[PDB]
């Protein structure tokens, strides 16, 4: 309640501080980093790329991360709280599904589904102990039947801890809008919901409706844009053809709106990507040097310059995110 | 070349014995026992579950199993390994891929592929140094574009180890054809490949033009059936309505149709099963209670008494495994 489950364990709600509110440190599948480590170069490859990175991101002002990769995304505890312990970043792990579930997943109930991820929150993932403090969730399009029991697993999980959802959307096709329905129909609060990729559409009414009744809105994809790659099929899919300052006018967009305290704001990035096309890292990170830290580098000046006050930005990056994540 | 790699090192041919070429400890996902042991009951129960099982299949004479879950059906080798060693059963480990394989896995090309499959075989599973001594592919239907790329693989890693192929078919959609036409393609033996899940089907044209090119035949569903089950959809769909004296029977025709040599038979038995409907495997222990000893048990008297010699059917469970799995 008063504290946040990371996977060094619990912290209080002052120390949290700049807060990416949706970062990976490895995209990948279960149990895929253990069996093929050679993916990644080495196990060792990755970690010191990834410390190296978020050491990089704390000099330009983070203090925590939430990692919303999933079971189903190759989430691994043990490996981010190495990377906590070695970039003095906070680390939040999240439970919940993503968008590759295998059949031992998607062939549960919404009960069995409810007691997954409550073992996530409440006990600990795997034998690790640690806890998650976030539950991820997704459609990509109209929810499938397995999808709509995940979102609905999620709204229990969260009424029985105050753990808060955030979620991955096909924007354009508005997804948010049947999470939500399907979210309020369990009787969750729209408060501790995050409406996530909210960046990837310029549709103000879809994106004020939901703010309207309370979403949070995760503009968290700020640096995704293969703008300079149109030759590339598979980055240009992946990353769209709007420019990063096209998506940043969004966190804008909403504050002259009046919906500053709903606005969270992320890179989405990684540092190893085996569930994409081979050496997509190698083009993202070519595409955006700086990693996680674009959003304090980069995105917070422009903001700024184009007359958004410090101690607006302050509250989407520090007040924002530890309000969303604190228990309640 | 005269040692076969189980879980618990290298064996030499005559120490394999009578074998079931086709079983499970569990059919789950890769990561799931793991993450949520608690649908086993527990870990503890499914290892004591799994070595009552295979001490009573020991009792009844066999001496070896080959697991063929691989990465994505949850395969977890350790866990292979703590059974073998309770009940001293051999069990051969797989690699490959079956009918769930995720994203980092469906992205790869035949060459990523190949390597890994190699990995599995020459190296090691995960950080364990168990080495895999058969490679399990999959189709369900005309094979997907990624299923080419994984019949390729398999066969491009069988070519340079020696080490057999194994298949997961729709039976009765004939998969066999095109799993053999892209194994051929590529230059594999077809002494080097067993065409799984044979007996889901009575087409004595489809299964005699596979042991003419000179296929191994794998009839390893014996005991499935849900014949008593008509209530239950979801068994009904996973097991079929054919008696298991009819796919019994089945060995007796390829037997006499002078295919001895290229039987394989098995259970298909879990004592696990996560990748299906909840408390199937309480359906199906209640089908057959004998488990994986429902082959020297139940099968061999039955053919024994439709006249099959006990020389032919220890050819069948003793000869044929042994030539099938020793590397060439
Ligand atoms: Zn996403
Ligand atoms: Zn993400
Ligand atoms: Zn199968
Ligand atoms: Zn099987």
Redesign the interface.
């Known amino acids: 309640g008063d504290r946040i489950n990371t996977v060094r364990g619990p912290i209080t709600i002052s120390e949290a501080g700049f807060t990416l509110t949706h970062e990976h440190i490895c995209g ?5 980093l ?3 480590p ?2 990644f170069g080495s196990r060792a490859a990755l970690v010191e790329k990834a410390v190296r990175g978020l050491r990089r991101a704390r000099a330009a002002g983070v203090r925590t991360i939430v990692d919303v990769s999933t ?2 995304a ?1 989430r691994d505890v043990s490996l981010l709280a190495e990377v906590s312990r070695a970039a003095d970043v906070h680390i939040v792990a999240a439970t919940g599904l993503w ?2 579930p ?4 998607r ?3 919404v009960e ?1 589904l409810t ?2 991820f409550l ?2 929150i409440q006990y600990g ?3 690790t102990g640690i806890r998650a403090g976030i539950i991820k969730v997704a459609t990509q399009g109209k929810a499938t039947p397995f999808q709509e029991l995940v979102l609905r697993a999620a709204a229990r999980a969260s009424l029985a801890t105050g753990v808060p959802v955030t979620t991955h959307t096909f924007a354009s096709q508005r997804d948010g809008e049947q999470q939500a329905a399907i979210f309020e129909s369990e009787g969750l609060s729209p408060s501790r919901v995050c409406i996530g990729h909210s960046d990837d559409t310029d549709d103000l009414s879809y994106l004020t409706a939901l703010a309207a009744r309370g979403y949070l809105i995760g503009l968290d994809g700020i640096p995704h844009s293969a703008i300079g790659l149109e030759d590339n099929a598979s980055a240009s899919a992946l990353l769209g053809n709007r420019s990063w300052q096209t998506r940043a006018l969004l966190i804008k967009a909403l504050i002259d709106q009046g919906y500053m305290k709903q606005i969270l704001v992320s890179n989405d990035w990684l540092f190893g990507f ?5 050496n997509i890292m190698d083009v993202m990170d070519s595409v955006n040097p700086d990693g996680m830290a674009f959003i304090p580098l980069r995105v917070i000046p422009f903001l700024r310059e184009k007359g958004v006050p410090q101690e607006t930005l302050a509250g989407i990056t520090v007040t924002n995110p530890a309000r969303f994540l604190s228990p309640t």
Do not use: H, K, N
């Not at 295998?102 to 997943?105: A, R």
């Open positions: 990948s599948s279960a149990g895929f253990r069996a093929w050679e993916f079971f189903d190759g968008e590759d295998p059949l031992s997943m062939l549960r109930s069995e007691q997954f073992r996530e993932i795997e034998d085996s569930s994409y096309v081979t």
